[PDB]
Design a protein around this ligand. Structure first.
Ligand SMILES: Nc1ncnc2c1ncn2[C@@H]1O[C@H](COP(=O)(O)OP(=O)(O)OP(=O)(O)O)[C@@H](O)[C@H]1O
Ligand SMILES: [NH3+][C@H]1C[C@@H]1c1ccccc1
Length: 518
């Protein structure tokens, strides 16, 4: 079996996760499930970014130890992934020894190699962004005798603080030409490629400054073994999760050798710089292969901009699932919000997706079909014979073309296009009923064969849609197979879509049709 390794960002458990976090984790889940159905040996990693002042200050404010705070927050996150039915193969916490020990080895190795040297970081820092800023990067900067003496982060808009402490530096500047050479040789590395140029212009052109990779002013993080008063910079700590979770630097590196390098790192656009500059340079310094692709999706937006945990301008996925069901929540996120751009959430757009696409187009397609099979054939769906109706040959071709087009969208992580292409077919299947007017055929017994043929095409079309939706919807496909009494597990797999009309034996469909949705 060919291997496929996909990761989400490990999220800061600094508050309740929102549909932004759900998008990343569902998107990763869809690709994992898709890749498993394609016959790949899949590992899907998610986790939590638990070190740094951002978390430590949240714990102290809550009046709790960092670890009690974190266990309570991680509990909330793991409840959400369970409810969203995320098929992640592992959950990595940066507070785990399997992670901390790898971060220790990596730092000690880069110190020994001389990539890391002791200095002092004197400059601006955003605790909420866990990001170093130059004075020119600050928004609403404050001037005093012609000097910038304060300002806000350009990312979060939180006030930055002045840092002046002993710090270990990683000489990332000497890897600049090698990184630019890598981009020249691998121009498809960031997807979509429209994110690459802004990142090079913003972060490499001005000159790769040496990265402050340790702190002495607080103690919540991995301690530098050779200099324990130093704590590893949360972003060095965090990035290592992708290889630490595979048992890199452990006795048995079988998981590492099998799944590294990662096929896809998922993220939103704001942390591309960490995954596209610092991460590849760190991997160069450790002499490890680079990730194959960074897939950076857009932001889910509200009326007041990017949906943000710290801001509070949020939509809780727990509310959406409890109120409208899981299928509607997963469908909305993947369909309404194209991967390669930003998208505004509205409750109106959510209910329209939920009611018109799921309940009406798909839900009513299944109900119409089973109702007619029960009415005309007393529940005995006649076996597929061939394209007996003059519309069938062309529709059977559309079924195959839907699978082909769907595949092309899925391989480029164009989830919204894959789903749009499936719904074009679901719409055409509904239109097949309107065109064939099977109620007219039910009159004479001379048309009983053709009526059977129409029923067999409706059901095979539904089966195609159900199989293609298995990565996206975890409830609807199983419910559809149950109600149609399709029990062959092979007829739920991608290979069964290779030739139209697999149901060549008669089937008793459910005598008690229930709504597929919610
Ligand atoms: N608005 C959003 N749209 C899409 N994905 C998002 C959004 N917000 C967060 N994410 C996902 O979570 C990642 C950022 O993780 P993080 O824990 O920093 O969330 P946050 O809401 O931006 O945090 P905070 O508001 O506390 O700064 C993104 O890279 C993406 O994977
Ligand atoms: N904003 C931080 C969550 C993202 C992250 C950093 C490094 C590795 C994985 C995830």
């Amino acid at each position: 079996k060919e291997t496929f390794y996909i990761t989400t960002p490990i999220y800061y458990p600094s508050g309740n996760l929102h549909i932004g976090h759900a998008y990343s984790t569902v998107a990763g889940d869809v690709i994992a499930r898709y890749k498993r159905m394609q016959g790949y040996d899949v590992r899907y990693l998610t986790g939590t970014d638990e070190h740094g002042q951002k978390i430590q200050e949240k714990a102290q404010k809550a009046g709790k130890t960092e670890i009690e705070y974190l266990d309570e927050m991680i509990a909330g996150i793991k409840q959400l992934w369970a409810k969203l039915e995320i098929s992640n193969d592992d959950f990595i916490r940066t507070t785990e020894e399997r992670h901390k020990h790898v971060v220790e080895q990596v730092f000690e190795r880069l110190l020994k190699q001389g990539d890391i040297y002791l200095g002092e970081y004197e400059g601006w820092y955003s605790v909420p962004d866990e990001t170093y800023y130059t004075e020119s990067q600050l928004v609403d900067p404050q001037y005093e005798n012609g000097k910038i003496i304060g300002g806000k982060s350009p990312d979060s808009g939180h006030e930055v603080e002045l840092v002046k402490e002993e710090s270990y530096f990683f000489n990332i500047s000497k890897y600049t030409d090698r990184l630019l050479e890598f981009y020249d040789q691998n121009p498809d590395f960031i997807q979509p490629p429209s994110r690459k140029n802004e990142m090079i212009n913003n972060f490499i052109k001005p000159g790769l400054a040496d990265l402050a990779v340790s702190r002495t002013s607080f103690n919540w993080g991995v301690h530098v073994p050779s200099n324990p008063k130093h704590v590893v910079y949360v972003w060095i700590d965090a990035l290592v999760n992708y290889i630490s979770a595979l048992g890199y630097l452990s006795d048995d590196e079988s998981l590492f050798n099998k799944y590294w390098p990662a096929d896809i790192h998922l993220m939103a656009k704001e942390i591309v710089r960490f995954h596209s500059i610092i991460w590849p340079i760190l991997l160069m310094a450790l002499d490890l292969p680079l990730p194959k692709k960074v897939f950076a999706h857009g932001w889910i937006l509200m009326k007041d901009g990017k949906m943000s945990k710290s801001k509070g301008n949020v939509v809780d996925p727990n509310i959406l699932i409890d109120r409208y069901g899981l299928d509607a929540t997963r469908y909305y996120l993947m369909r309404e919000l194209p991967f390669g751009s930003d998208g505004v959430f509205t409750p109106e757009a959510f209910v329209e997706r939920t009611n018109f696409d799921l309940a009406n187009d798909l839900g009513n397609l299944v109900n119409r079909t089973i109702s007619m099979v029960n009415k005309y054939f007393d529940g005995e769906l006649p076996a597929y014979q061939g394209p007996l109706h003059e519309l069938d040959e062309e529709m059977e071709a559309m079924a195959l073309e839907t699978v082909k087009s769907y595949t092309e969208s899925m391989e480029s992580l164009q989830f919204s296009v894959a789903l749009s292409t499936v719904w074009k077919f679901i719409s055409r299947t509904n239109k097949y009923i309107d065109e064939t007017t099977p109620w007219v055929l039910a009159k004479d017994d001379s048309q009983k064969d053709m009526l059977g043929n129409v029923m067999a095409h409706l059901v095979e079309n539904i089966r195609y849609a159900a199989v293609l939706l298995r990565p996206f919807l975890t409830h609807a496909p199983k419910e559809i197979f149950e109600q149609l009494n399709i029990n062959n597990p092979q007829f739920m797999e991608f290979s069964s879509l290779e030739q139209y009309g697999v149901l060549n034996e008669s089937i008793m469909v459910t005598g008690q049709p229930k709504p597929i949705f919610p």
